[PDB]
Write an enzyme that holds these catalytic residues in place. Structure first.
Site, PDB file in Angstrom:
ATOM      1  N   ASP A  39      -5.213  23.961 -26.895  1.00 53.51           N
ATOM      2  CA  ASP A  39      -5.341  23.618 -28.314  1.00 53.51           C
ATOM      3  C   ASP A  39      -6.176  22.353 -28.441  1.00 53.51           C
ATOM      4  O   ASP A  39      -5.640  21.241 -28.291  1.00 53.51           O
ATOM      5  CB  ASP A  39      -3.960  23.412 -28.891  1.00 53.51           C
ATOM      6  CG  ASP A  39      -4.013  23.050 -30.365  1.00 53.51           C
ATOM      7  OD1 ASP A  39      -5.056  23.164 -30.970  1.00 53.51           O
ATOM      8  OD2 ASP A  39      -2.920  22.676 -30.889  1.00 53.51           O
ATOM      9  N   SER A  63     -21.131  20.102 -39.612  1.00 56.75           N
ATOM     10  CA  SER A  63     -22.055  21.217 -39.648  1.00 56.75           C
ATOM     11  C   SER A  63     -23.145  20.951 -40.686  1.00 56.75           C
ATOM     12  O   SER A  63     -22.859  20.314 -41.706  1.00 56.75           O
ATOM     13  CB  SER A  63     -21.303  22.522 -39.969  1.00 56.75           C
ATOM     14  OG  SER A  63     -22.128  23.588 -40.189  1.00 56.75           O
TER      15      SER A  63
END
Ligand SMILES: Cc1csc(Cc2ccccn2)n1
Ligand code: NA
Length: 330
Positions: A35, A199
């Site tokens: 994770d 992004s």
């Protein structure tokens, strides 16, 4: 040193991925959920309340000659999805894919929430976010990656998750055969303890690319892609009959649909998520309403590039003094 381990989807939807991990001496092999959005290595154990265990493999520290109680230490964690676990702490030898760390903190669960009990395939989590998020008290502990880092050939790990297929986690090297083209690296902020990056924008299907900054985290322990409501609405508007369902808890779509791809920007580079990756199947068994793999982040407080996004790429988690992320197509 290096390590290399295969990661395998737990079910036909790729809800999560499990990776075998050796703990203790002699080895006890448990299948953990790696994770990158959390920082605790915790396991179902011989201490876990008997009624909260259903088919998991447990760690038994009393059978490990290298296990040591970490006296006084406790831990307690809550995830973004509402699940939780807590317990006490041992140190032991932990190996992943041939890479061994001695004295790793292995957090032994005394309690777990129902979502963990009901997932028989996940024996615990191995956190790969920054060690500043580790929940051990009173002495915070390091992740497996942070403990391994100095020993590694290169202070990196990579995630290569499969679509409906096994993939690979590598530690200490970048397998240049595992991706196409070049890796584009992008800046990371560690201020929230995550692999947080920005992004450069998105496209829906064959549509034009929208240049827009989308801050979010690279999180292998989250199934879906959570993005701002404007982006998500633009995606699902291209699917006839898709709608946001308050009853179901997100966007659903007709199972008869063909989904468009979704592109996200990494610098000047582009990662394309095929439409099929965004199908999470019937909302209930036999339903013709299917659950979408792109959902709004508006009720989270962060955007999350979970497995839907990451499995479309080869992803480099660069733990150099100034961390960075890298993405390649594959
Ligand atoms: C929908 C989904 C994603 S991962 C998963 C399995 C799971 C969730 C929480 C705790 C333990 N196992 N179910
Ligand atoms: Na779900």
């Amino acid at each position: 040193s290096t390590g290399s381990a295969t990661t395998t989807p737990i079910d036909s939807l790729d809800d999560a991925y499990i990776t075998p991990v050796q703990i203790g001496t002699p080895a006890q092999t448990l299948n953990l959920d790696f994770d990158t959005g959390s920082s605790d290595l915790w396991v179902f154990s011989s201490e876990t309340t008997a009624s909260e265990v259903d088919g998991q493999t447990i760690y038994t520290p009393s059978k490990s000659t290298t296990a040591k109680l970490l006296s006084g230490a406790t831990w307690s964690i809550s995830y973004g999805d509402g699940s939780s676990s807590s317990g006490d702490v041992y140190t032991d030898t932990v190996s992943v894919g041939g890479l061994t760390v001695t004295g790793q903190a292995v957090e032994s669960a005394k309690k777990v929430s129902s979502s963990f009990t009901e997932d028989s395939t996940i024996d615990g989590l191995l956190g790969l976010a920054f060690s500043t998020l580790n929940t051990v008290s009173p002495t915070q502990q390091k992740t497996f990656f942070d403990n391994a880092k100095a020993s590694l050939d290169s202070p990196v790990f990579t995630a290569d998750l499969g679509y409906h297929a096994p993939g690979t986690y590598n530690f200490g090297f970048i397998d240049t055969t595992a991706y196409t083209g070049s890796i584009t690296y992008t800046a990371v902020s560690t201020k929230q303890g995550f692999w947080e990056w920005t992004s450069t924008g998105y496209a829906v299907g064959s549509g034009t690319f929208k240049s827009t900054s989308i801050d979010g985290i690279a999180d292998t322990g989250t199934t879906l892609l959570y993005l701002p409501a404007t982006v998500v609405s633009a995606y699902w508007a291209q699917v006839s009959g898709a709608k946001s369902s308050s009853s179901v808890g997100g966007y659903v779509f007709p199972c008869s649909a063909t989904l468009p791809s979704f592109t996200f920007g990494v610098g000047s580079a582009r990662i394309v998520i095929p439409g099929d990756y965004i199908d999470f199947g019937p909302i209930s068994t036999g339903s013709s309403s299917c659950f979408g793999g792109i959902q709004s982040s508006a009720g989270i407080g962060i955007n999350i590039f979970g497995d839907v996004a990451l499995k479309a790429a080869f992803v480099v988690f660069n733990g150099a003094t100034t961390p960075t992320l890298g993405f390649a197509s594959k």
